[PDB]
Design a binder for these strands. Structure first.
Lengths: 228, 71, 148
RNA sequence: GCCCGGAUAGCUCAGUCGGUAGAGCAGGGGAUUGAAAAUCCCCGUGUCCUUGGUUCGAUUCCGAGUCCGGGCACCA
RNA sequence: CGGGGGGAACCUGGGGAACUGAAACAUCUCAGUACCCAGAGGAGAGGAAAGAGAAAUCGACUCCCUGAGUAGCGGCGAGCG
RNA sequence: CCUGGUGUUGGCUCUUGGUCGCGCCUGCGUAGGAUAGGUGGGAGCCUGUGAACCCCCGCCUCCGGGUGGGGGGGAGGCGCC
RNA sequence: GGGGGCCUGACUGCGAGGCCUGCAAGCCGAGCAGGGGCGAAAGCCGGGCCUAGUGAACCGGUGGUCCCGUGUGGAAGGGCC
């Protein structure tokens, strides 16, 4: 009845009988873990879909407002003014079909690719073969193609957090900082509640949001009732 | 008469049949089975005071026997 | 199937119970027998009738007990023995006490239940606990002395 | 039309991480075949019915598409 | 003490059929009709509403006229109602 | 006629299967200090072993190894990189 | 009829007035409207070069519609396209 984790104390904080609710969560998590540096809490969950038959495979992104600087890099592929807008907006990788060519060669440092409709052909067909089933090629309703290279990369820097059910039907995303206001963690938990809810493919039949919770990096793990 | 019930009347009639369905499913009724039949219960018993019976019929039975069991 | 049982408790473990044993089952298989009868005002009542019954019974018990508890714990119990200045020649049997309080003073009690392991006969008084009614014991100051 | 089921080389059947393919019997080449038979050695030898899809990568995994076989309800 | 035994037709319930129609005919049709029965009468039948009907309305039951042969039931066909 | 359900057609019992609830344990095509089952958080973690050095013992296998325990003690190890 | 370009009217609303025919059929169609497409346009296009590739009525399905609902709100269900 004794286990291998010093976290044990934090675990004692952890009383897994209730699934509680969001704001409560902000507070008890914020308290629960501030180990090395300050907790990097995150929320994770699983939906009653079936990602094999991609007719439910979701992803996208809500806009949990709150300053940013880390996670999921992206390539702003376009030309002059777009390099301007998106680069400044908040880009990790920037350029155009020249960057596309560099990638075809041996340079790929971006998980998501967002290109404006001006170098989109070169991006998708030149780099189509390269970014491929990696998730690195631009798609017109996958928050990856369009002129607002600046707007989207911008949010990438000011606050982004995306969605993408993994193999077994679950998503992960940042919806509040560690020492961050409880009500805050609540609100972001929410924006995610919503965009996620929307993504909810019409291919669901019943208890869709099955398990919805807040867990940290290295720390506690408790479900939250995004209802209250 | 010699086989109705004992605890009321359950000895008689029955007109019936069928054919087939497929209605609020895909169409009309495969209609027909001009047939006729019987339709009834069962028998059993207990004791007055050393030496008895009952006879009767099914349910009505069960409640009943309970009743005169009361006496 | 409200089977009310007299001789039953899941076997001949009698009264204080009622269970279900389906139609015929409980019916002619478990109760034709003669170990229980079914609900009804007659039966449920029955339980109520005699339950009240024991309530009053035991209650009463407790009561008479009290009348005697008071009277006795109250009074001193003095008795006459024959001896020198220690144990009487013929042992002091709490039963003896019995005859004593009993018709020598008034209220009576059965020897059996009491407080007396072996004959007590040192002399003078000892006040002991002879439990008369199951949780309410009668305690008393008993002294017998050589009436010389 | 419903559900169970068979289809890969000439014949027959083999994988739930899938992520690397054929195998038993015939056809070509080579030893024991003194004769053969027979036997071994070898090779040739393939989309796993069609098609995209989840899939880095799944032919056995997702959906739909043939021809066929067994058991239901169809037109009334 | 009672019944039973009758009785042309009327009568209640009990059980209950092919024709013919549908120019075939298997749903359907004649129909709950013919007939076997049991039985109360002089007539039984029904007979004071878990009714009607939607107006903040009626008011037992039965039979006549009307209610439409419309409302409708259906190899929506013969027809039936 | 044969035959699932179900009603009288009550009692104790040996047991075996599917399912969901929690707990444990698992994952070796190949470069991969290495049997990475994914996708998340994501450079730090820990001292009731005072340790990865050593000891046996529990368990699962595709040599290896993974995991769970009892002990033995003298700032150490590993994830980072 | 043979070749190239560009394109959907192989349009909805509809049609006057005629072919034949007793029934129902089937068949021919200027021109008015909305709406487009081939030329710059005088205009052609409401399938093909034409005469065969066809089937009532019931029944029921689906994409409407958003008409009806058996007191009223909705609805099973249902009327027309």
């Amino acid at each position: 009845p004794k286990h291998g984790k010093r976290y044990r104390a934090l675990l004692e904080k952890v009383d897994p009988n209730k699934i509680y609710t969001i704001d409560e969560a902000a507070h008890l998590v914020k308290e629960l873990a501030t180990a090395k540096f300050d907790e990097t809490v995150e929320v994770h969950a699983k939906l009653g879909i079936d990602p094999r038959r991609s007719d439910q495979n979701v992803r996208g992104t809500v806009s949990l407002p709150h300053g940013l600087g880390k996670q999921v890099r992206v390539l702003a592929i376009a030309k002059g003014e777009k390099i301007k807008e998106a680069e400044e907006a908040g880009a990790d990788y920037v350029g155009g079909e020249e960057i596309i060519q560099k990638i075809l060669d041996g340079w790929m440092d971006f998980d998501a690719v967002v290109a404006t409709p001006d170098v989109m052909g070169a991006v998708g067909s030149k780099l189509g073969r390269i970014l491929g089933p990696r998730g690195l090629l631009p798609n017109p309703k996958a928050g990856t193609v369009g002129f607002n290279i600046g707007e989207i990369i911008r949010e990438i820097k000011a606050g982004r957090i995306e969605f993408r059910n993994d193999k077994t039907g679950a998503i992960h995303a940042p919806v509040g900082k560690a020492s961050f206001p409880p009500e805050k963690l609540a609100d972001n938990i929410r924006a995610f509640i919503r965009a996620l809810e929307a993504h909810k493919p019409e291919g669901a039949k019943g208890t869709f949001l099955r398990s919805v919770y807040v867990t940290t990096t290295m720390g506690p793990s408790v479900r939250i009732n995004p209802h209250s | 008469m010699k086989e109705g019930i004992h605890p009321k009347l359950v000895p008689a009639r029955i007109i019936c049949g069928c054919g087939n369905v497929i209605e609020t499913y895909s169409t009309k009724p495969e209609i027909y089975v001009e047939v006729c039949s019987k339709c009834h219960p069962f028998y059993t018993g207990q004791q007055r005071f050393v030496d008895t019976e009952g006879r009767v019929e099914r349910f009505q039975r069960r409640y009943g026997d309970s009743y005169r069991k009361g006496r | 199937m409200k089977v009310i049982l007299l001789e039953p408790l899941e076997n001949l473990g009698d009264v204080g119970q009622v269970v279900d044993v389906k139609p015929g089952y409980a019916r002619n298989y478990l109760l034709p027998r003669g170990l229980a009868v079914l609900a009804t005002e007659s039966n449920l009542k029955a339980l109520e009738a005699r339950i009240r019954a024991q309530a009053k019974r035991l209650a009463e018990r407790k009561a008479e007990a009290e009348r005697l508890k008071k009277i006795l714990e109250n009074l001193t119990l003095t008795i006459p023995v024959r001896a020198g200045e220690t144990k009487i020649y013929g042992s002091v049997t709490a039963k003896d006490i019995a005859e004593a309080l009993s018709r020598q003073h008034g209220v009576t009690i059965d020897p059996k239940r009491l407080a007396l392991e072996k004959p007590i006969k040192e002399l003078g008084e000892y006040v002991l606990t002879y439990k008369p009614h199951p949780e309410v014991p009668i305690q008393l100051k008993v002294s017998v002395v050589a009436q010389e």
